[PDB]
Amino acid sequence: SDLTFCEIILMEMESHDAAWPFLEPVNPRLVSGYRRIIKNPMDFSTMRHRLSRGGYTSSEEFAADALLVFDNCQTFNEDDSEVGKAGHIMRRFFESRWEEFY
Ligand SMILES: CCc1c(-c2csc(N3CCNC[C@@H]3C(=O)NCC(C)(C)C)n2)[nH]c(C)c1C(C)=O
Ligand SMILES: [Mg+2]
């Protein structure tokens, strides 16, 4: 039941217009300094894969990964960059959906 809500939230994030920076892992070969600055990368497909194999024991673990996506986004990208702007939309979306489930 805890995992049901995560499937709904993850499905909605995956299909969101603003999800485009977060659908796949950042390729550090293409992004100078990413490996240096971001210690714990995370993205929606990594969450999908972990959800698929049953690798989340609780919804709190799922939310930790979601928040990590947006913490990494704000650590690496300017708030007015295209990726930063998309990350703020996605972060607010996640927080608001998470709250109306718990
Ligand atoms: C800015 C990199 C980044 C992305 C991301 C995922 S798809 C994407 N793009 C697609 C089309 N044009 C804009 C941009 C792009 O390819 N720019 C060229 C590079 C910089 C890849 C050489 N960007 N997602 C996250 C979370 C990122 C970071 C650094 O946090
Ligand atoms: Mg926080």
Side-chain angles (χ1 to χ4, degrees):
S1 72
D2 256 9
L3 291 167
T4 292
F5 288 163
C6 301
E7 291 279 358
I8 295 168
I9 289 179
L10 184 52
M11 169 201 50
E12 283 169 1
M13 292 193 301
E14 281 170 327
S15 68
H16 197 297
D17 284 352
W20 61 268
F22 311 109
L23 297 174
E24 296 297 314
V26 173
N27 189 340
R29 295 165 165 178
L30 308 177
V31 181
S32 177
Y34 196 82
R35 228 33 144 206
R36 178 178 39 86
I37 291 167
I38 292 303
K39 302 307 183 293
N40 297 121
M42 184 51 57
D43 68 281
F44 295 167
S45 72
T46 301
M47 293 166 59
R48 166 61 56 191
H49 291 349
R50 180 171 177 191
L51 199 52
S52 293
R53 60 184 182 90
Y56 287 115
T57 71
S58 64
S59 65
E60 285 101 298
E61 293 184 337
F62 174 90
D65 273 354
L67 294 186
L68 180 59
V69 176
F70 308 126
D71 289 330
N72 294 340
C73 180
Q74 293 173 87
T75 296
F76 196 85
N77 304 275
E78 309 276 5
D79 296 313
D80 51 7
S81 66
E82 283 296 325
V83 168
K85 289 189 283 184
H88 286 305
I89 297 171
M90 287 311 303
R91 183 185 47 77
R92 282 190 297 269
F93 178 82
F94 171 77
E95 285 184 21
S96 77
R97 274 311 252 132
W98 189 261
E99 267 157 37
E100 59 191 280
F101 282 136
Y102 308 103

Short mmCIF file of all heavy atoms in Angstrom, two decimals, residues 13-26 43-44 77 81-87 89-90:
data_model
loop_
_atom_site.label_atom_id
_atom_site.label_comp_id
_atom_site.label_asym_id
_atom_site.label_seq_id
_atom_site.Cartn_x
_atom_site.Cartn_y
_atom_site.Cartn_z
N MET A 13 5.47 11.61 -12.22
CA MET A 13 6.70 12.36 -12.45
C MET A 13 7.32 12.00 -13.79
O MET A 13 7.73 12.89 -14.55
CB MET A 13 7.70 12.14 -11.31
CG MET A 13 7.23 12.75 -10.01
SD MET A 13 8.53 12.82 -8.77
CE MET A 13 8.98 11.09 -8.62
N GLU A 14 7.37 10.70 -14.12
CA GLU A 14 7.93 10.25 -15.39
C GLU A 14 7.26 10.91 -16.59
O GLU A 14 7.91 11.19 -17.60
CB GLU A 14 7.80 8.72 -15.49
CG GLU A 14 8.85 7.92 -14.71
CD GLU A 14 8.50 6.42 -14.65
OE1 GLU A 14 7.30 6.08 -14.62
OE2 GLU A 14 9.43 5.59 -14.66
N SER A 15 5.95 11.15 -16.52
CA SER A 15 5.23 11.71 -17.67
C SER A 15 5.07 13.22 -17.61
O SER A 15 4.41 13.79 -18.48
CB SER A 15 3.86 11.04 -17.80
OG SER A 15 3.02 11.41 -16.73
N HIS A 16 5.66 13.89 -16.62
CA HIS A 16 5.51 15.33 -16.46
C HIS A 16 6.32 16.08 -17.53
O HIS A 16 7.43 15.66 -17.89
CB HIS A 16 5.97 15.72 -15.06
CG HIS A 16 5.51 17.07 -14.60
ND1 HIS A 16 5.89 18.24 -15.23
CD2 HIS A 16 4.74 17.44 -13.56
CE1 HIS A 16 5.36 19.27 -14.60
NE2 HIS A 16 4.66 18.81 -13.57
N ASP A 17 5.77 17.19 -18.04
CA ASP A 17 6.49 18.01 -19.02
C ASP A 17 7.88 18.41 -18.53
O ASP A 17 8.83 18.47 -19.32
CB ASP A 17 5.70 19.27 -19.36
CG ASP A 17 4.53 19.00 -20.29
OD1 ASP A 17 4.39 17.86 -20.80
OD2 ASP A 17 3.74 19.95 -20.52
N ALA A 18 8.01 18.70 -17.23
CA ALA A 18 9.27 19.17 -16.66
C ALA A 18 10.23 18.04 -16.26
O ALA A 18 11.27 18.31 -15.66
CB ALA A 18 8.98 20.07 -15.46
N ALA A 19 9.91 16.78 -16.59
CA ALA A 19 10.74 15.66 -16.16
C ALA A 19 11.95 15.45 -17.04
O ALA A 19 12.82 14.65 -16.68
CB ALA A 19 9.93 14.37 -16.13
N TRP A 20 12.04 16.14 -18.18
CA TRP A 20 13.05 15.81 -19.17
C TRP A 20 14.49 15.80 -18.64
O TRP A 20 15.28 15.00 -19.16
CB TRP A 20 12.92 16.75 -20.38
CG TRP A 20 13.11 18.21 -20.06
CD1 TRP A 20 12.13 19.11 -19.72
CD2 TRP A 20 14.35 18.92 -20.05
NE1 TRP A 20 12.70 20.35 -19.50
CE2 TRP A 20 14.06 20.26 -19.69
CE3 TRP A 20 15.68 18.56 -20.31
CZ2 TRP A 20 15.05 21.23 -19.59
CZ3 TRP A 20 16.66 19.54 -20.21
CH2 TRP A 20 16.34 20.85 -19.85
N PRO A 21 14.91 16.61 -17.66
CA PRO A 21 16.31 16.49 -17.19
C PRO A 21 16.57 15.25 -16.36
O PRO A 21 17.74 14.89 -16.15
CB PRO A 21 16.54 17.76 -16.36
CG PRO A 21 15.34 18.64 -16.61
CD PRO A 21 14.23 17.71 -16.94
N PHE A 22 15.52 14.58 -15.88
CA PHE A 22 15.64 13.61 -14.80
C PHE A 22 15.27 12.20 -15.22
O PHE A 22 15.27 11.29 -14.37
CB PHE A 22 14.79 14.06 -13.62
CG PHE A 22 15.01 15.50 -13.26
CD1 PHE A 22 14.03 16.45 -13.50
CD2 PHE A 22 16.23 15.91 -12.70
CE1 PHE A 22 14.24 17.80 -13.18
CE2 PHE A 22 16.45 17.24 -12.37
CZ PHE A 22 15.45 18.19 -12.61
N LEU A 23 15.00 11.97 -16.50
CA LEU A 23 14.52 10.67 -16.94
C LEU A 23 15.62 9.62 -16.98
O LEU A 23 15.34 8.43 -16.83
CB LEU A 23 13.86 10.79 -18.31
CG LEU A 23 12.61 11.68 -18.33
CD1 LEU A 23 12.09 11.86 -19.74
CD2 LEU A 23 11.54 11.07 -17.44
N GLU A 24 16.87 10.03 -17.20
CA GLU A 24 18.01 9.13 -17.33
C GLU A 24 19.17 9.66 -16.51
O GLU A 24 19.25 10.87 -16.27
CB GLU A 24 18.45 9.00 -18.80
CG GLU A 24 17.43 8.37 -19.73
CD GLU A 24 17.11 6.93 -19.36
OE1 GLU A 24 18.06 6.15 -19.09
OE2 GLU A 24 15.92 6.57 -19.33
N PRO A 25 20.10 8.79 -16.08
CA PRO A 25 21.27 9.27 -15.33
C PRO A 25 22.05 10.30 -16.13
O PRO A 25 22.19 10.19 -17.35
CB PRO A 25 22.09 8.00 -15.09
CG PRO A 25 21.13 6.88 -15.24
CD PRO A 25 20.11 7.33 -16.25
N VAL A 26 22.56 11.32 -15.43
CA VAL A 26 23.46 12.28 -16.06
C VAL A 26 24.72 11.55 -16.52
O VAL A 26 25.27 10.73 -15.78
CB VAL A 26 23.79 13.40 -15.07
CG1 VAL A 26 24.86 14.33 -15.62
CG2 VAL A 26 22.51 14.20 -14.70
N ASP A 43 18.21 9.56 -10.43
CA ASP A 43 17.32 9.95 -11.51
C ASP A 43 16.10 9.03 -11.52
O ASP A 43 16.07 8.01 -10.83
CB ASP A 43 18.03 9.88 -12.86
CG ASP A 43 18.34 8.46 -13.24
OD1 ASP A 43 19.34 7.90 -12.72
OD2 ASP A 43 17.56 7.89 -14.03
N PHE A 44 15.10 9.39 -12.34
CA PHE A 44 13.83 8.68 -12.29
C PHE A 44 13.94 7.25 -12.80
O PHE A 44 13.21 6.37 -12.32
CB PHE A 44 12.74 9.42 -13.09
CG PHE A 44 12.36 10.77 -12.53
CD1 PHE A 44 11.59 11.65 -13.29
CD2 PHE A 44 12.75 11.16 -11.26
CE1 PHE A 44 11.22 12.89 -12.79
CE2 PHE A 44 12.40 12.40 -10.76
CZ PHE A 44 11.62 13.28 -11.53
N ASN A 77 22.94 23.04 -10.72
CA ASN A 77 22.38 23.96 -11.71
C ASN A 77 21.93 25.26 -11.07
O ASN A 77 21.36 25.25 -9.97
CB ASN A 77 21.21 23.30 -12.42
CG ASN A 77 21.59 21.99 -13.05
OD1 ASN A 77 22.11 21.96 -14.17
ND2 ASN A 77 21.38 20.89 -12.33
N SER A 81 18.71 28.47 -14.66
CA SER A 81 19.03 27.65 -15.82
C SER A 81 17.81 26.85 -16.25
O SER A 81 16.84 26.72 -15.49
CB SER A 81 20.20 26.70 -15.52
OG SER A 81 19.82 25.75 -14.54
N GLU A 82 17.85 26.32 -17.47
CA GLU A 82 16.71 25.54 -17.97
C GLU A 82 16.50 24.29 -17.12
O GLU A 82 15.35 23.93 -16.82
CB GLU A 82 16.90 25.17 -19.44
CG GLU A 82 16.64 26.31 -20.42
CD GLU A 82 15.19 26.80 -20.42
OE1 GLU A 82 14.26 25.99 -20.23
OE2 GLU A 82 14.99 28.02 -20.61
N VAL A 83 17.58 23.61 -16.74
CA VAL A 83 17.45 22.43 -15.90
C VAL A 83 17.03 22.83 -14.49
O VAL A 83 16.18 22.18 -13.87
CB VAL A 83 18.76 21.62 -15.90
CG1 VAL A 83 18.73 20.56 -14.81
CG2 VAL A 83 18.99 20.98 -17.29
N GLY A 84 17.61 23.91 -13.96
CA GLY A 84 17.20 24.37 -12.64
C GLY A 84 15.72 24.72 -12.59
O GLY A 84 15.01 24.34 -11.65
N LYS A 85 15.23 25.43 -13.60
CA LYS A 85 13.81 25.78 -13.62
C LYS A 85 12.94 24.53 -13.68
O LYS A 85 11.91 24.45 -12.99
CB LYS A 85 13.50 26.72 -14.80
CG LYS A 85 14.05 28.13 -14.65
CD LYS A 85 13.53 29.08 -15.72
CE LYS A 85 14.22 28.87 -17.04
NZ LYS A 85 13.77 29.86 -18.07
N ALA A 86 13.33 23.54 -14.49
CA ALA A 86 12.54 22.31 -14.55
C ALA A 86 12.58 21.57 -13.22
O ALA A 86 11.57 20.99 -12.80
CB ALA A 86 13.05 21.43 -15.69
N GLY A 87 13.74 21.57 -12.55
CA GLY A 87 13.85 20.91 -11.27
C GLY A 87 13.00 21.54 -10.18
O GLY A 87 12.50 20.84 -9.30
N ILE A 89 10.07 23.01 -10.76
CA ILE A 89 8.71 22.55 -11.04
C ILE A 89 8.52 21.11 -10.57
O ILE A 89 7.50 20.77 -9.97
CB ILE A 89 8.41 22.70 -12.55
CG1 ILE A 89 8.45 24.19 -12.94
CG2 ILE A 89 7.06 22.08 -12.89
CD1 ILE A 89 8.38 24.45 -14.44
N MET A 90 9.51 20.26 -10.83
CA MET A 90 9.39 18.85 -10.45
C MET A 90 9.44 18.69 -8.94
O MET A 90 8.70 17.88 -8.37
CB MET A 90 10.50 18.02 -11.09
CG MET A 90 10.32 17.80 -12.59
SD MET A 90 8.66 17.24 -13.07
CE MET A 90 8.47 15.73 -12.10
#
